Amino acid sequence: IAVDPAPRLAGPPVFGGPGNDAFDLAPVRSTGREMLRFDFPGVSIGAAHYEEGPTGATVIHIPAGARTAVDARGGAVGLSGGYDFNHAICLAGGAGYGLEAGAGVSGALLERLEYRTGFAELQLVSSAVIYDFSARSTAVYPDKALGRAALEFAVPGEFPQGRAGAGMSASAGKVDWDRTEITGQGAAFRRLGDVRILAVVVPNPVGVIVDRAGTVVRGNYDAQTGVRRHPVFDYQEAFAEQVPPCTISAIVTNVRMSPVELNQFAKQVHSSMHRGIQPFHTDMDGDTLFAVTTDEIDLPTTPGSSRGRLSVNATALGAIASEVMWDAVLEAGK
Amino acid sequence: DPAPRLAGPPVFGGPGNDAFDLAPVRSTGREMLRFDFPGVSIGAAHYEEGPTGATVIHIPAGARTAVDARGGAVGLSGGYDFNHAICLAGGAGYGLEAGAGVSGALLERLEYRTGFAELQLVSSAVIYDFSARSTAVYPDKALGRAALEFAVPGEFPQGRAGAGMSASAGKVDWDRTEITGQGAAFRRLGDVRILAVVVPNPVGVIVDRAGTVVRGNYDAQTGVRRHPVFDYQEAFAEQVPCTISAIVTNVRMSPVELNQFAKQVHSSMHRGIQPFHTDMDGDTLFAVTTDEIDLPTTPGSSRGRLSVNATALGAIASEVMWDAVLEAGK
């Protein structure tokens, strides 16, 4: 993944501006910088934005419904539903206001079900948000209309990389706002003997995006030096001086996992993201990962292979999925 | 032995929101509870088309909150540790949209400021009230906004009002389920204020302090209500082989104290709702403090050496909540 070295500073935040009804808001189908194509029947992605924000929503639609585990960390989580079974996952900007996009998805799915309301027929949408108001001078947020649009725009086997959907105004590196850079959204996909793994991420971290060599590639760009340093350098200097003597993501797979296995898998993959995002899981962050299984293929009963006695299990799947997710984070930062 | 209010056999569908020009109605319920709690407002609105509604507790200053959620059918949005409003609604997960109406309205009242510390925080919870009516209408953004607009200090509409319009109890069998309502109770002790608000839509039944089943699981064949355990035990012998609530106070409590308080009060509701906290329920309690009054540094009184602390307040608030549950079932 060839990350662009060039800066994309978000610029100084004003923390307000016109809101939704100031505009005749037309949803735009987000195309981003490039399209990822993937083969995962039953999983569709739609992304829609308002240019007037700019802000957007990204919807993962799984009409069969799929078992889900939710892993939320940090002090600024913005989550609706958080269900253990979902027909859609809605990721959006606009902080807590943007949870309204998920209502637009929910209402649209109820209409599609011809207003059936049996308990077993409830259409379940979990939503999570990023605080993207630092990155733009408006108060526009993903509303019901934008969530419904994202669901209507959902295509099988495509994902718009970059500044698209929820990633429109995502940004990283918030030691100081003058060093914060626009990120984007990202996705990656791997197929391994029939096994399918899709990672979707919208990194809006306090921390920075880091590649596999340990280089900081997005966030904390100091325009006085022309480089990005790990935040810890700023934090340690800040302490010598003053104390002298928000990433939302989904990992979707077709491998059957029990509720316990799936929850453990979610925690493992989520923690793994502290490789590519640093710091991560902070009090300042609202990090929410959804781990979704479409329950299509079984792990073998015993975990052995020629690569080891403990080589084929949900931990192994978690390790593989963790790499897919790191690739998706790097696509968001590219 | 109150007269039955059987909900009747569910259809699980009928016309939805898009079929009507939905008109919010200010809910008045069967009677108004009046109380004195500065800085707290309550609004309730409903659609007769459902019937279904939303009840909003507005604390404009914002208040520290603990959330305690139990069971397999929880429907929650936000669940924040600090809230400007709590939105309770029918319509199952679809009715979480009412809370978005409140949130958007509060952003407009803030003149569209978006600083992190100025975010307007609304936590919402819902009941599944589609079994109790033959429509698919749900509380929408417009209904949550209306509930906020209708909010006033010091009033609560008891009974079939707001989120309580189509709440119901006793779900061993839908033929024995009865309409409940919403309820509130208030106590003042010196400067200490405790308000309880509840929307009991339980699988279980409402039980009074004597142990009498007073709402839910009414058999029209017998004219009597039954505790569900009698039905369950006989079911086993033969075959083998949600409540959303808020407790609001003015007593300062640390985050740890507040969260322990929330769990205590919530568990206490298994006295008045039985069974409770079941996998079939989505029970969600919000414990909210306006942080106005300090507890003493030491817990003693003439009533005992360990008599004034958060456990104590929890025990008192538990009784206020039982009273609210009984109002909802009346």
XYZ file of C-alpha atoms in Angstrom:
664
model
C 0.000 0.000 0.000
C 1.684 3.208 -1.357
C 0.603 5.826 1.229
C 0.891 9.402 -0.195
C 3.672 11.171 1.836
C 2.040 14.579 1.054
C 0.242 16.372 3.918
C -3.573 16.569 4.073
C -3.941 18.902 7.039
C -7.550 19.320 8.094
C -6.904 22.925 9.157
C -7.889 24.914 12.201
C -11.308 24.013 13.618
C -14.049 26.655 14.235
C -16.424 24.059 15.938
C -19.672 25.229 14.341
C -21.421 26.633 11.259
C -24.695 26.101 9.294
C -26.800 23.030 10.016
C -28.798 20.581 7.903
C -31.891 22.698 7.085
C -29.700 25.612 5.979
C -29.160 23.477 2.856
C -31.253 21.628 0.296
C -29.280 18.456 1.029
C -29.045 15.929 -1.810
C -27.334 12.649 -0.985
C -24.333 11.914 -3.269
C -23.265 8.342 -3.942
C -19.683 8.322 -2.722
C -17.108 6.939 -5.169
C -13.950 7.949 -3.261
C -10.537 7.660 -4.887
C -10.827 4.035 -6.046
C -13.185 1.086 -5.826
C -12.307 -2.118 -4.014
C -14.060 -5.112 -5.659
C -14.608 -8.240 -3.599
C -16.556 -11.483 -3.839
C -18.766 -11.934 -0.753
C -22.357 -12.680 -1.737
C -24.834 -11.486 0.916
C -22.779 -8.465 1.956
C -23.362 -5.083 0.222
C -21.904 -1.662 0.999
C -23.437 1.700 0.290
C -21.805 5.037 0.909
C -23.449 8.408 0.692
C -22.359 11.937 1.541
C -23.493 15.499 1.772
C -20.972 17.789 0.087
C -22.265 20.633 2.295
C -20.732 18.998 5.385
C -18.721 17.377 3.989
C -19.897 14.326 5.955
C -21.299 10.930 5.159
C -22.526 7.473 6.093
C -21.416 3.956 5.096
C -23.901 1.086 5.403
C -23.085 -2.626 5.369
C -26.264 -4.488 4.416
C -26.582 -8.200 5.197
C -30.250 -8.952 4.442
C -30.176 -12.495 5.888
C -29.140 -11.000 9.206
C -25.872 -12.012 10.850
C -24.630 -12.773 14.361
C -22.571 -9.884 15.659
C -20.247 -9.081 18.548
C -19.642 -5.449 19.502
C -16.397 -4.295 21.112
C -16.439 -0.633 22.285
C -13.544 1.146 23.985
C -12.740 4.684 25.079
C -14.592 7.634 26.597
C -16.352 9.007 23.458
C -18.171 5.957 22.048
C -21.264 6.788 19.998
C -23.301 3.611 19.497
C -26.946 2.742 18.743
C -28.396 -0.739 18.979
C -25.235 -2.727 19.445
C -27.295 -5.820 18.645
C -26.029 -9.407 18.689
C -27.735 -9.903 15.265
C -27.875 -7.290 12.542
C -29.358 -6.743 9.100
C -27.167 -3.663 8.702
C -24.275 -1.793 10.269
C -24.321 1.998 9.782
C -21.097 3.980 10.264
C -21.417 7.778 10.104
C -19.961 11.177 10.798
C -21.734 13.900 12.784
C -20.951 12.620 16.274
C -24.015 11.464 18.196
C -26.317 13.381 15.792
C -25.194 11.027 13.030
C -26.729 8.014 14.762
C -29.879 9.328 13.025
C -28.559 7.821 9.770
C -29.162 4.381 11.240
C -32.796 5.295 11.873
C -33.114 5.979 8.144
C -31.768 2.482 7.436
C -34.072 0.908 10.031
C -37.182 2.636 8.698
C -36.327 1.709 5.102
C -35.797 -1.964 6.043
C -39.234 -1.979 7.865
C -40.834 -0.635 4.653
C -39.043 -3.347 2.642
C -40.523 -5.957 5.047
C -44.010 -4.579 4.269
C -44.370 -3.219 7.855
C -44.311 -6.732 9.450
C -43.567 -6.305 13.207
C -43.233 -9.754 14.693
C -40.417 -9.913 17.159
C -38.450 -12.425 15.021
C -38.938 -10.048 11.939
C -37.515 -6.914 13.574
C -34.918 -5.306 11.264
C -31.852 -4.664 13.371
C -29.352 -1.918 12.580
C -26.379 -1.116 14.769
C -24.845 2.308 14.243
C -21.620 3.968 15.295
C -20.293 7.473 14.781
C -17.187 9.592 14.523
C -16.839 13.167 15.709
C -15.968 14.880 12.349
C -16.994 18.438 13.241
C -13.268 19.468 13.851
C -12.584 18.884 10.147
C -15.124 21.329 8.664
C -16.939 24.567 9.354
C -20.546 23.280 9.247
C -22.947 21.482 11.602
C -24.421 19.253 8.863
C -24.741 15.655 10.036
C -25.822 12.317 8.524
C -29.592 12.328 8.906
C -32.321 9.780 8.204
C -32.371 10.745 4.567
C -28.593 10.087 4.245
C -28.797 6.694 5.936
C -31.691 5.670 3.666
C -29.620 6.895 0.650
C -26.577 4.874 1.737
C -28.789 1.752 1.985
C -30.330 2.511 -1.473
C -26.761 2.976 -2.888
C -25.578 -0.358 -1.458
C -23.908 -2.486 -4.094
C -22.693 -6.016 -3.692
C -18.891 -6.501 -3.779
C -17.790 -2.834 -3.951
C -16.331 -0.383 -1.521
C -15.302 3.254 -2.260
C -11.888 3.888 -0.692
C -10.833 7.218 0.750
C -12.968 10.308 1.206
C -16.309 8.556 0.855
C -19.252 7.833 3.153
C -18.388 8.047 6.821
C -14.764 8.672 5.874
C -15.533 12.023 4.121
C -14.223 14.132 7.014
C -12.446 11.542 9.158
C -9.074 12.741 10.531
C -6.128 11.568 12.618
C -3.550 12.868 15.065
C -5.069 15.114 17.694
C -2.317 16.113 20.084
C -2.905 19.460 18.471
C -5.472 20.277 15.812
C -2.784 22.069 13.714
C -1.158 18.644 13.028
C -4.378 16.707 12.351
C -4.713 15.179 8.851
C -7.731 13.968 6.911
C -7.822 10.176 6.664
C -10.743 8.558 4.829
C -12.428 5.165 5.014
C -10.804 1.938 3.937
C -11.565 -1.665 3.193
C -9.650 -4.844 2.454
C -10.656 -8.350 1.553
C -9.050 -11.805 1.575
C -10.298 -15.156 0.350
C -8.461 -18.296 1.763
C -9.832 -21.730 0.779
C -13.557 -20.554 0.651
C -12.968 -18.501 3.873
C -13.819 -14.834 3.273
C -12.781 -11.881 5.408
C -13.854 -8.275 4.789
C -12.541 -5.388 6.903
C -14.112 -1.928 6.820
C -12.703 0.959 8.847
C -13.334 4.664 9.425
C -10.313 5.844 11.428
C -10.895 9.208 13.096
C -8.279 8.589 15.816
C -6.709 10.787 18.412
C -3.644 8.733 17.450
C -1.916 8.317 14.100
C -1.847 5.644 11.389
C 1.328 3.509 11.425
C 2.559 1.098 8.773
C 4.105 -2.326 9.302
C 7.616 -0.845 9.448
C 6.592 1.471 12.327
C 6.457 4.588 10.222
C 3.793 7.194 10.980
C 1.989 7.695 7.627
C -1.080 9.777 8.487
C -1.684 12.213 11.358
C 0.462 14.415 13.542
C 2.105 16.184 10.563
C 4.141 19.138 11.879
C 4.139 21.760 9.118
C 7.192 23.369 10.813
C 9.296 20.162 10.293
C 7.627 18.498 7.275
C 7.372 15.157 9.077
C 5.040 13.073 11.191
C 6.349 11.914 14.600
C 4.697 9.363 16.866
C 2.476 11.208 19.387
C 4.471 9.795 22.298
C 7.305 12.231 21.443
C 4.914 15.144 21.860
C 3.378 13.654 25.016
C 6.792 13.000 26.678
C 8.014 16.513 25.844
C 4.679 17.938 27.133
C 5.236 16.150 30.465
C 8.938 17.321 30.859
C 7.435 20.832 30.294
C 4.099 21.070 32.274
C 4.659 18.400 35.057
C 8.266 19.352 35.978
C 9.899 18.203 39.245
C -12.759 7.393 17.435
C -12.215 4.535 14.946
C -15.359 2.663 13.925
C -14.921 -0.610 12.117
C -16.365 -3.934 11.019
C -14.767 -7.305 10.412
C -17.108 -9.584 8.459
C -16.420 -13.269 7.819
C -18.271 -16.315 6.555
C -16.748 -18.695 9.199
C -19.219 -19.953 11.788
C -18.307 -18.857 15.330
C -20.314 -19.351 18.531
C -21.260 -16.178 20.444
C -18.314 -16.731 22.841
C -15.822 -17.335 19.990
C -17.145 -14.320 18.043
C -16.866 -11.996 21.074
C -13.297 -13.144 21.728
C -12.484 -12.742 18.022
C -13.850 -9.171 18.128
C -11.649 -8.266 21.101
C -8.562 -9.794 19.470
C -9.043 -8.047 16.118
C -9.882 -4.763 17.821
C -6.765 -4.845 20.030
C -4.696 -5.727 16.971
C -5.531 -2.289 15.579
C -3.200 -0.673 18.144
C -0.488 -1.804 15.685
C -1.790 0.454 12.950
C -3.321 3.204 15.087
C -1.285 4.641 17.969
C -2.302 5.418 20.630
C -5.601 3.570 20.422
C -8.429 2.655 22.801
C -7.868 5.958 24.639
C -10.275 7.840 26.877
C -10.419 10.459 24.189
C -11.468 7.912 21.509
C -14.828 6.230 20.776
C -13.511 3.017 19.216
C -16.229 0.568 18.165
C -15.643 -2.669 16.255
C -18.378 -4.963 14.959
C -17.403 -8.594 14.335
C -19.963 -10.211 12.047
C -20.233 -13.834 10.915
C -22.522 -14.978 8.109
C -22.280 -18.525 9.514
C -21.612 -20.214 6.108
C -18.607 -22.476 6.716
C -17.372 -24.576 9.692
C -13.847 -24.629 11.210
C -12.678 -28.261 11.458
C -13.505 -30.015 14.787
C -9.797 -30.423 15.555
C -7.259 -27.527 15.190
C -4.225 -29.269 13.614
C -2.439 -28.872 10.263
C 1.102 -29.519 9.024
C 1.863 -25.970 10.401
C 0.953 -27.003 13.958
C -1.304 -28.665 16.524
C -3.023 -25.311 17.337
C -3.124 -23.778 13.821
C -6.810 -23.893 12.642
C -9.264 -22.202 15.123
C -10.917 -18.861 15.731
C -7.666 -17.375 17.184
C -5.954 -18.262 13.884
C -8.836 -16.638 11.967
C -8.459 -13.611 14.250
C -4.786 -13.287 13.362
C -5.568 -13.440 9.637
C -8.445 -10.964 10.027
C -6.154 -8.627 11.979
C -3.924 -8.326 8.890
C -6.936 -7.603 6.646
C -7.932 -4.872 9.071
C -4.451 -3.322 9.117
C -4.603 -3.212 5.297
C -7.970 -1.449 5.501
C -6.557 1.126 7.957
C -3.683 1.812 5.545
C -6.145 2.198 2.668
C -8.035 4.803 4.748
C -4.777 6.690 5.412
C -3.372 6.366 1.866
C -58.306 -6.785 42.151
C -58.321 -4.212 39.305
C -60.490 -4.712 36.298
C -58.764 -6.414 33.373
C -57.217 -4.508 30.497
C -56.420 -7.397 28.118
C -54.444 -6.208 25.107
C -56.033 -8.819 22.883
C -54.567 -11.163 20.271
C -51.708 -9.602 18.329
C -51.707 -9.225 14.502
C -47.957 -8.196 14.304
C -48.472 -5.673 11.413
C -51.044 -3.148 9.895
C -50.394 0.381 8.468
C -47.072 2.112 9.098
C -45.871 5.703 9.405
C -45.935 6.441 5.622
C -49.703 5.619 5.491
C -50.697 8.628 7.671
C -50.220 12.333 8.104
C -49.020 11.731 11.653
C -50.168 14.385 14.131
C -48.325 14.528 17.439
C -50.617 14.718 20.457
C -49.513 16.041 23.850
C -50.121 13.096 26.187
C -52.109 13.894 29.353
C -52.720 10.328 30.570
C -55.245 9.549 33.291
C -53.868 12.110 35.734
C -50.912 14.434 36.249
C -48.278 13.950 38.939
C -46.957 17.315 40.093
C -43.601 17.698 41.767
C -40.794 20.224 42.438
C -37.463 19.341 40.825
C -35.717 22.362 39.382
C -33.754 21.800 36.203
C -35.725 18.695 35.149
C -38.568 18.872 32.581
C -40.744 16.033 31.175
C -42.626 15.920 27.886
C -44.768 13.151 26.466
C -46.244 12.878 23.001
C -48.072 10.155 21.132
C -49.570 9.223 17.806
C -53.163 8.017 18.164
C -52.500 6.155 14.865
C -50.381 3.640 16.722
C -51.235 4.197 19.468
C -47.575 4.651 20.472
C -45.488 7.430 21.997
C -42.357 8.911 23.483
C -41.515 10.360 26.868
C -38.555 12.763 27.208
C -36.780 13.777 30.402
C -34.947 17.060 29.629
C -32.153 18.266 31.894
C -30.863 21.287 29.973
C -27.712 21.724 32.114
C -26.760 18.117 31.428
C -26.414 15.442 34.130
C -24.075 12.618 34.972
C -25.710 9.283 34.171
C -25.173 5.572 34.738
C -26.872 2.996 32.482
C -27.768 -0.498 33.599
C -29.133 -2.806 30.814
C -30.237 -6.440 31.264
C -31.877 -9.193 29.196
C -31.731 -10.276 25.559
C -34.000 -7.618 23.939
C -32.355 -4.324 25.026
C -32.958 -1.433 22.619
C -30.595 1.386 23.540
C -28.983 4.368 21.782
C -26.160 6.476 23.192
C -26.085 5.171 26.754
C -23.939 8.167 27.601
C -22.385 8.909 30.972
C -23.693 12.512 30.684
C -27.065 13.473 29.168
C -29.123 16.492 28.304
C -32.124 14.198 27.734
C -33.388 10.662 28.163
C -35.898 9.515 25.517
C -38.122 6.524 26.261
C -40.300 5.266 23.386
C -42.406 2.515 21.887
C -41.871 1.045 18.422
C -39.053 -1.322 19.305
C -35.729 -0.391 17.705
C -37.529 1.781 15.148
C -38.595 4.085 17.967
C -34.982 4.958 18.776
C -35.561 7.484 15.976
C -37.494 9.642 18.454
C -34.261 10.311 20.298
C -32.681 11.635 17.088
C -35.523 14.179 16.973
C -34.589 15.325 20.440
C -30.842 15.442 19.584
C -31.373 17.472 16.400
C -33.676 19.898 18.214
C -31.103 20.403 20.954
C -28.399 21.148 18.326
C -30.695 23.829 16.846
C -31.263 25.287 20.370
C -27.424 25.396 20.764
C -27.216 27.539 17.620
C -25.384 24.688 15.840
C -22.223 24.826 18.008
C -20.312 21.554 17.653
C -17.402 21.725 20.102
C -16.829 18.394 21.759
C -17.793 19.761 25.207
C -21.024 21.271 23.734
C -22.317 18.047 22.149
C -26.016 17.569 23.101
C -26.299 14.040 24.443
C -29.524 12.049 24.360
C -29.766 8.460 25.513
C -32.795 6.545 24.226
C -34.411 3.255 25.117
C -37.391 1.456 23.626
C -40.101 -1.072 24.296
C -41.544 -3.583 21.858
C -45.186 -2.419 21.804
C -46.247 -3.901 18.429
C -48.044 -6.893 20.141
C -50.503 -4.440 21.775
C -51.926 -2.827 18.582
C -52.679 -3.667 14.952
C -50.422 -0.991 13.360
C -46.712 -0.590 12.540
C -46.583 3.129 13.452
C -43.503 3.994 15.502
C -42.199 7.066 17.310
C -40.279 9.051 14.698
C -37.995 12.061 14.712
C -41.012 14.396 14.637
C -42.592 12.687 17.706
C -39.372 12.990 19.738
C -39.123 16.627 18.840
C -42.795 17.124 19.855
C -42.173 15.410 23.231
C -39.256 17.774 23.870
C -41.381 20.784 22.800
C -44.144 19.680 25.216
C -41.719 19.259 28.138
C -42.473 21.268 31.245
C -41.124 21.319 34.762
C -42.845 19.469 37.566
C -45.459 17.403 35.627
C -45.784 13.781 34.578
C -48.774 12.234 32.767
C -49.567 8.896 34.409
C -50.919 5.906 32.546
C -51.484 5.666 28.799
C -49.240 8.573 27.842
C -45.992 8.906 25.864
C -43.994 5.728 25.782
C -46.637 4.047 27.943
C -49.466 4.270 25.353
C -49.204 0.624 24.336
C -46.991 -0.874 27.056
C -48.195 -4.224 28.352
C -47.349 -6.937 30.880
C -47.532 -10.716 31.298
C -46.308 -12.606 28.250
C -46.463 -16.282 29.093
C -49.312 -16.177 26.601
C -50.468 -13.098 24.587
C -54.140 -13.992 25.441
C -53.368 -13.033 29.109
C -51.276 -9.887 28.466
C -52.652 -6.624 29.865
C -52.037 -2.979 29.005
C -49.914 -1.177 31.585
C -48.942 2.466 30.996
C -46.120 4.661 32.230
C -45.738 5.804 35.820
C -43.857 8.212 37.996
C -43.316 8.874 41.681
C -41.467 11.559 43.589
C -40.134 11.983 47.108
C -38.409 14.842 48.871
C -36.446 14.208 52.116
C -35.051 17.478 53.435
C -33.231 18.848 50.352
C -32.923 15.348 48.744
C -35.120 14.821 45.667
C -35.833 11.475 43.934
C -37.976 11.117 40.802
C -38.698 7.689 39.336
C -40.073 7.247 35.808
C -40.932 3.835 34.400
C -42.428 2.269 31.271
C -43.030 -1.370 32.199
C -43.563 -3.586 29.134
C -42.466 -6.742 30.954
C -42.643 -10.394 30.114
C -43.419 -10.658 33.811
C -46.257 -9.189 35.859
C -46.590 -6.213 38.199
C -46.657 -7.246 41.892
C -47.586 -5.080 44.862
C -45.900 -4.976 48.306
C -48.221 -7.680 49.642
C -47.194 -10.051 46.824
C -50.463 -9.650 44.908
C -50.294 -9.811 41.094
C -51.987 -6.545 40.063
C -51.343 -6.309 36.295
C -50.504 -8.953 33.684
C -51.227 -12.633 33.107
C -55.021 -12.299 33.502
C -56.994 -15.405 32.445
C -60.452 -14.386 31.220
C -61.524 -18.126 31.771
C -60.991 -17.670 35.554
C -61.173 -13.894 36.211
C -57.829 -14.076 38.056
C -54.223 -13.067 37.424
C -51.487 -15.557 38.132
C -47.804 -15.214 38.923
C -45.983 -16.586 35.823
C -44.015 -19.099 37.855
C -47.163 -21.167 38.350
C -47.584 -21.362 34.583
C -43.903 -22.131 33.999
C -43.713 -24.860 36.673
C -46.763 -26.654 35.310
C -45.426 -26.224 31.731
C -42.203 -28.029 32.805
C -44.133 -30.763 34.635
C -46.136 -31.331 31.362
C -43.500 -30.878 28.543
C -40.045 -31.884 30.021
C -40.649 -34.591 29.225
C -38.845 -4.806 28.586
C -39.011 -2.207 31.257
C -37.297 1.113 30.556
C -36.814 3.433 33.480
C -35.059 6.399 35.008
C -34.200 7.309 38.539
C -33.264 11.012 38.801
C -31.845 12.604 41.953
C -30.074 15.729 43.058
C -27.559 13.924 45.311
C -23.889 14.126 44.253
C -22.504 10.668 43.548
C -19.181 9.727 42.030
C -19.221 7.673 38.777
C -18.612 4.467 40.796
C -21.331 5.340 43.365
C -23.810 6.243 40.602
C -23.224 3.024 38.702
C -23.584 0.895 41.860
C -26.734 2.872 42.726
C -28.150 2.158 39.265
C -27.558 -1.589 39.616
C -29.079 -1.659 43.091
C -32.237 0.228 42.097
C -32.605 -1.827 38.930
C -32.341 -5.158 40.763
C -34.840 -3.879 43.340
C -37.475 -3.802 40.560
C -37.618 -7.606 40.633
C -39.809 -6.974 43.710
C -42.515 -5.262 41.662
C -41.988 -6.987 38.270
C -41.721 -10.767 38.248
C -39.876 -12.342 36.588
C -37.504 -9.507 35.660
C -34.107 -9.195 33.941
C -34.994 -12.169 31.757
C -33.512 -13.094 28.393
C -36.911 -12.219 26.882
C -36.767 -8.651 28.331
C -34.827 -5.536 27.363
C -34.635 -3.868 30.744
C -32.742 -0.548 30.773
C -32.429 1.809 33.757
C -30.840 5.275 33.673
C -29.606 6.671 36.990
C -29.184 10.448 36.632
C -27.851 12.956 39.158
C -27.966 16.728 38.978
C -25.012 16.769 41.477
C -26.570 19.534 43.683
C -26.496 18.062 47.296
C -23.527 16.408 49.130
C -23.879 13.255 51.269
C -22.135 13.676 54.646
C -18.445 12.572 54.863
C -19.428 10.032 57.562
C -22.519 7.791 57.382
C -23.939 7.934 60.937
C -27.346 9.151 62.287
C -29.602 8.353 65.309
C -30.916 5.507 62.998
C -27.508 3.808 62.763
C -23.782 4.052 62.174
C -24.165 2.989 58.441
C -27.371 4.887 57.689
C -26.502 7.845 55.319
C -24.632 6.874 52.046
C -25.378 5.833 48.438
C -26.690 2.372 49.470
C -29.144 4.218 51.732
C -30.203 6.508 48.908
C -30.527 3.442 46.693
C -32.875 1.780 49.142
C -35.073 4.889 49.291
C -35.020 5.333 45.483
C -35.986 1.637 45.125
C -39.245 2.413 46.975
C -39.946 5.470 44.776
C -39.439 3.225 41.726
C -41.819 0.553 43.081
C -44.428 3.308 43.546
C -43.881 4.386 39.899
C -44.290 0.809 38.661
C -47.584 0.542 40.556
C -48.769 3.837 39.025
C -47.984 2.460 35.570
C -50.060 -0.669 36.285
C -52.977 1.116 37.967
